[PDB]
Amino acid sequence: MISLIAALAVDRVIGMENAMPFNLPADLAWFKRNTLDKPVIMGRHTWESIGRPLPGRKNIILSSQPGTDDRVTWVKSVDEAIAACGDVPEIMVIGGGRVYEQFLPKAQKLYLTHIDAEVEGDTHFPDYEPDDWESVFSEFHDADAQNSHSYCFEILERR
Amino acid sequence: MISLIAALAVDRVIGMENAMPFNLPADLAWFKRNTLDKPVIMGRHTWESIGRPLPGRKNIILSSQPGTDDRVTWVKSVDEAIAACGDVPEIMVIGGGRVYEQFLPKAQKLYLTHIDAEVEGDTHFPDYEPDDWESVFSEFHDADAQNSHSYCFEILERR
Numbered sequence: 395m396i397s398l399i400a401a402l403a404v405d406r407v408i409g410m411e412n413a414m415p416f417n418l419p420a421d422l423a424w425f426k427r428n429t430l431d432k433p434v435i436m437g438r439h440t441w442e443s444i445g446r447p448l449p450g451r452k453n454i455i456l457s458s459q460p461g462t463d464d465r466v467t468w469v470k471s472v473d474e475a476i477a478a479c480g481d482v483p484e485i486m487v488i489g490g491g492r493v494y495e496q497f498l499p500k501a502q503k504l505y506l507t508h509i510d511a512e513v514e515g516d517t518h519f520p521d522y523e524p525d526d527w528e529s530v531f532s533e534f535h536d537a538d539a540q541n542s543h544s545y546c547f548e549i550l551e552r553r
Numbered sequence: 554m555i556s557l558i559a560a561l562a563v564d565r566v567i568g569m570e571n572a573m574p575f576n577l578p579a580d581l582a583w584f585k586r587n588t589l590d591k592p593v594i595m596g597r598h599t600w601e602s603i604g605r606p607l608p609g610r611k612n613i614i615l616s617s618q619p620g621t622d623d624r625v626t627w628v629k630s631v632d633e634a635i636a637a638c639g640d641v642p643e644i645m646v647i648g649g650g651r652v653y654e655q656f657l658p659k660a661q662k663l664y665l666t667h668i669d670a671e672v673e674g675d676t677h678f679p680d681y682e683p684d685d686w687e688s689v690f691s692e693f694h695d696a697d698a699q700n701s702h703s704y705c706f707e708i709l710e711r712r
């Protein structure tokens with residue numbers, strides 16, 4: 395099963411290349427807990443923003459360009475990405491934009507972080523009709539000394 | 554000598570009610586490089602914000618209240634804070650507002666990180682007379698894949 399995991403600001407805006415103007419360690423922890431011990435698929439800009447292989451996860455980079463680094467797996471197509479994953483219960487797609495567009499149709503689950511921040515931006519997480527998806531978990535959190543903005547974690551199941 | 558090290562947004566904002574919305578690892582790396590192996594003096598709110606003792610430095614907390622952590626040194630006066638640093642060439646004051654106000658008069662150098670961001674602030678860096686300070690180093694950088702805003706490092710020496 396394929397799942398997409400993303401942190402969205404108001405209007406579904408997501409990052410493009412530069413880091414997003416928010417500071418949410420709670421969301422990085424959530425991100426870690428849900429992707430650890432699973433394969434993760436990401437595009438080239440996400441890989442540069444991360445800056446190193448995520449430990450405890452098989453790192454698959456989907457891109458047209460060449461593999462700089464030998465520590466990760468570089469694939470040129472969606473099909474190739476999937477295969478690199480092997481037979482596992484759940485595959486995590488971690489962005490960016492175009493990557494989410496390509497895998498959404500195949501997605502059965504969504505782990506989203508709705509952040510209360512207005513950011514100006516070009517990219518948006520793909521439009522999804524929440525009535526083709528069932529909201530199974532929702533938990534709100536206020537901003538605090540460590541987290542810059544309020545945020546809400548949500549898991550959706552493809553109905 | 555005593556030096557003050559701070560990150561200031563536009564209008565000299567140094568803090569907000571919650572965590573600042575900047576994701577700036579380069580500023581934390583400039584912060585570590587300039588404070589490593591030196592004693593650091595901070596207020597209680599900054600201490601609670603960091604979360605742990607900073608590695609490789611002598612952590613001194615200036616507070617009227619009683620200490621809650623055995624790994625650091627708790628002091629109640631500026632005079633006490635200084636004495637606790639001993640005989641070192643340079644003592645670093647890392648915030649927040651009130652602590653900076655108390656130590657400014659005694660500081661000979663400022664290491665500042667100007668961040669290009671407009672925010673509503675809670676606390677601000679004290680007003681300094683740009684005429685009493687000599688900029689001896691400046692370095693601008695744009696936002697990038699890992700840094701959310703553009704910023705500029707500057708070191709000033711009292712004239």
Ligand SMILES: CN(Cc1cnc2nc(N)nc(N)c2n1)c1ccc(C(=O)N[C@@H](CCC(=O)O)C(=O)O)cc1
Pocket residue numbers: 399400401421422423425426440443444448449487488489506507
């Ligand atoms: C820029 N980027 C991609 C990123 C960031 N937040 C997201 N948050 C969510 N919810 N979803 C994503 N797909 C997402 N992706 C990053 C950057 C750093 C780390 C990171 O360092 N993660 C550590 C945890 C925090 C740490 O070690 O400093 C980990 O083990 O996953 C993860 C993703």
Ligand SMILES: CN(Cc1cnc2nc(N)nc(N)c2n1)c1ccc(C(=O)N[C@@H](CCC(=O)O)C(=O)O)cc1
Pocket residue numbers: 558559560580581582584585599602603607608646647648665666
């Ligand atoms: C909230 N806080 C206070 C903070 C943050 N940025 C500042 N930036 C500047 N330039 N000056 C300050 N006084 C400043 N203070 C922090 C928070 C974290 C760390 C911190 O973990 N720094 C690590 C380096 C970063 C890392 O290894 O993740 C260190 O070793 O100094 C420091 C100060």
Ligand SMILES: [Ca+2]
Pocket residue numbers: 687688689690
């Ligand atoms: Ca100069």
Ligand SMILES: [Cl-]
Pocket residue numbers: 436437438439440441489490491493
């Ligand atoms: Cl990407």
Ligand SMILES: [Cl-]
Pocket residue numbers: 595596597598599600648649650652
């Ligand atoms: Cl403080």
